[PDB]
């Protein structure tokens, strides 16, 4: 089966909800740099960053290796609470299996996003890998 | 026969239409980053990004390999629909035959473009290849 | 004979006018990104971008390779007419002999310039080569 | 025992306080480029910049090497004093042992950050190192 | 004899005046991107851009190679006259001997600067080389 | 003996004052790009740009090579006076010894800065090198 990008995104979100029942996990249309959490719990936004596709490796078939980029951004008022939450995410997400992916979820980087509206924001960037197989 | 750039983008556009009838496919002058869809349907803007020409290869004839960049950008309110739509562009367009091109259409990258006017925007960037042959 | 830059630009313009009698061809002081055509004919602006000089090949003579960059930008109202216009330039200019240059004209790239003042703009970037020979 | 990022920041801050009792050391949600100190002392803001994770090294297990970036920014009215305090930060933090890290704290770079609100600002960027080990 | 930077600039300026008596040659404090001449004669602004010094060759003496950058910008109302003038500078300056320099003046690049206040502007970038020898 | 950054800045300053008594030499918190001198004397601003520390060279001792960047900026009304003063800086500063540094002062580059407030500005960028040794 081919990968459905949204399913990969939901897998990350659901694993996070299961291991962290007291976190508000969203897949939002709003950028995490500015997003305002409404709940009384630690808030994490899941975002699909994009993909880079490698050329077909000298093959008759249009088959391409795809590297998927996904971010999870913690948004909480205190700096210390944001850093603790960040440790929870990587411990929750590093190495999990993703559907229709050819290897586990890998950690790429963590970065400070900002402090807009008095919420401290830190992002964990991750990568997944899959094979795009063109219709014939 | 020499490649007609407009024919290549019409092929990409026609292919998308036949496979995705509820999509509103445009070849526009406005940048997909700021374009505001009129109406409610899923919107896709097809755009010819340009070409890079390799040097002739130590020969008497002026023959140049040409790499053609084309983008298809989804523009919709909900990000879940944007991602679903991007999956549809990808299986519709990957590996298709293009008139007077050297190889099938190849996928290059997918990227989040933005959320201007509250429309989530995702672009699928693709490449075509042809051989430019100078007149003698 | 030393290469006369304006003569090279003139060769491009003339060639273009002879093969495209209904195009309005200019060597203007105004940037093609902002230029607004006075008529309804397909308009092309020809421009000298600059040169890069290679350092002398370490000989008792100060002789330097020079790579001239030249743009031709089509300025037309509809996006599809712009694309068709680019095709005409490529076919017209690719591989022509330029006066006092070491080789034919080579294509370099095609890029979307923009859509200011209701005119779609595409540029064809080209290169020419000559030997700068310093005086005694 | 996996690393707790906040512990690493606390260790750097505590080390600084103990060796520099006249300094005002914070772990703030405010960027050190703009922060306006409320006092006459030497103010130092500690910040967790982020991390980069190397790929697992051809191993079945998801084990990733983590490089942690941390800054300590001095904020002092006169430059002479900012430079002196910067020297003190080096001497205090360079080569120290950090909890659950696989090597001592390393210095990376120092840079002038600005003079906002008439307080000279220099940052000391440092790196810590640890091994991220995915839960199986 | 140590190189006097101003003497190099003066040599370039004087050489230009002698071979081009109708040009107006200046060494100005104003950037040639914005300078506005009164009148429509060919104006040329000479400017010392800066130098790059190579590390001493790991020998017992602090001896550093110095690559000097100098620009000559033509400021002319009509584009075709700006190009003819640019050809004139290159023929006048390419290969000339400069006081206390270890080699002739070399051309580096030609670049379109802009069309501010209705004057076309092209810069000819050139390099000179000398040997900086440290005192004791 | 550990390297004291302010002391290196002072040595540069003092060396300049001894060889150039009519220059007004400062260590200021104002960026030499906008600083407005009062008086007729040639003004030079000395600034500590920052440092880069190389990793400890495969040793079990935190010892790190430090490359220090320092700028000296000439601020003078006339272009020719600024250029002459730049020559005086380079002749005064190149290759002098610095306290607790492992080699002489090296010139890196010279750059034109700007002409703000009718003062022509040029900077000489230099590097010192030292060895940072961590406390046990
Ligand atoms: Ca819950
Ligand atoms: Ca291949
Ligand atoms: Ca339809
Ligand atoms: Ca005609
Ligand atoms: Ca205290
Ligand atoms: Ca003479
Ligand atoms: Ca005259
Ligand atoms: Ca002395
Ligand atoms: Cl929880
Ligand atoms: Cl559909
Ligand atoms: Cl025509
Ligand atoms: Cl203290
Ligand atoms: Cl003349
Ligand atoms: Cl003096």
mmCIF file of C-alpha atoms in Angstrom, chain D residues 15 77-81 83-84 86-87 90-91 94-97 104-112 115 120 122 124-125, chain F residues 2-6 9-10 27-31 46-56 62 64 66 132 134-136:
data_model
loop_
_atom_site.group_PDB
_atom_site.id
_atom_site.type_symbol
_atom_site.label_atom_id
_atom_site.label_comp_id
_atom_site.label_asym_id
_atom_site.label_seq_id
_atom_site.Cartn_x
_atom_site.Cartn_y
_atom_site.Cartn_z
ATOM 1 C CA UNK D 15 27.591 26.938 38.170
ATOM 2 C CA UNK D 77 25.752 49.072 30.087
ATOM 3 C CA UNK D 78 29.471 49.556 29.274
ATOM 4 C CA UNK D 79 31.492 47.422 26.785
ATOM 5 C CA UNK D 80 34.591 47.196 28.932
ATOM 6 C CA UNK D 81 32.485 45.446 31.561
ATOM 7 C CA UNK D 83 33.970 41.943 27.728
ATOM 8 C CA UNK D 84 35.231 41.322 31.282
ATOM 9 C CA UNK D 86 32.329 37.440 28.976
ATOM 10 C CA UNK D 87 35.839 36.327 30.047
ATOM 11 C CA UNK D 90 34.295 31.246 29.640
ATOM 12 C CA UNK D 91 36.390 30.510 32.698
ATOM 13 C CA UNK D 94 34.198 25.823 29.698
ATOM 14 C CA UNK D 95 35.023 22.164 30.248
ATOM 15 C CA UNK D 96 32.428 21.512 32.949
ATOM 16 C CA UNK D 97 30.710 18.239 33.564
ATOM 17 C CA UNK D 104 32.357 18.006 29.050
ATOM 18 C CA UNK D 105 30.704 21.295 28.061
ATOM 19 C CA UNK D 106 32.472 22.828 25.043
ATOM 20 C CA UNK D 107 32.803 26.416 23.908
ATOM 21 C CA UNK D 108 31.635 27.082 20.349
ATOM 22 C CA UNK D 109 31.723 30.840 19.675
ATOM 23 C CA UNK D 110 31.330 34.369 21.060
ATOM 24 C CA UNK D 111 29.477 37.145 19.265
ATOM 25 C CA UNK D 112 28.448 40.758 19.666
ATOM 26 C CA UNK D 115 23.344 47.538 22.255
ATOM 27 C CA UNK D 120 26.018 46.094 25.420
ATOM 28 C CA UNK D 122 27.641 39.550 23.974
ATOM 29 C CA UNK D 124 28.741 32.782 24.505
ATOM 30 C CA UNK D 125 27.393 29.860 22.522
ATOM 31 C CA UNK F 2 44.795 33.089 30.409
ATOM 32 C CA UNK F 3 44.028 35.495 27.574
ATOM 33 C CA UNK F 4 42.084 38.553 28.717
ATOM 34 C CA UNK F 5 40.036 39.914 25.833
ATOM 35 C CA UNK F 6 39.936 43.541 26.964
ATOM 36 C CA UNK F 9 41.777 45.261 22.654
ATOM 37 C CA UNK F 10 43.824 47.682 24.745
ATOM 38 C CA UNK F 27 36.595 51.586 22.225
ATOM 39 C CA UNK F 28 32.916 52.549 21.884
ATOM 40 C CA UNK F 29 29.500 50.944 22.309
ATOM 41 C CA UNK F 30 28.275 52.764 19.192
ATOM 42 C CA UNK F 31 28.518 50.865 15.888
ATOM 43 C CA UNK F 46 38.083 49.493 17.950
ATOM 44 C CA UNK F 47 35.618 46.641 18.381
ATOM 45 C CA UNK F 48 35.644 43.065 19.529
ATOM 46 C CA UNK F 49 33.631 41.175 16.909
ATOM 47 C CA UNK F 50 33.688 37.801 18.619
ATOM 48 C CA UNK F 51 35.532 34.461 18.646
ATOM 49 C CA UNK F 52 35.328 30.937 17.237
ATOM 50 C CA UNK F 53 36.575 28.011 19.344
ATOM 51 C CA UNK F 54 37.718 24.836 17.593
ATOM 52 C CA UNK F 55 36.874 21.477 19.153
ATOM 53 C CA UNK F 56 39.416 19.890 21.547
ATOM 54 C CA UNK F 62 39.188 20.573 27.279
ATOM 55 C CA UNK F 64 40.392 24.785 22.551
ATOM 56 C CA UNK F 66 40.433 30.358 19.812
ATOM 57 C CA UNK F 132 41.657 28.500 25.847
ATOM 58 C CA UNK F 134 39.597 25.023 30.956
ATOM 59 C CA UNK F 135 39.868 24.941 34.755
ATOM 60 C CA UNK F 136 40.022 21.548 36.482
#
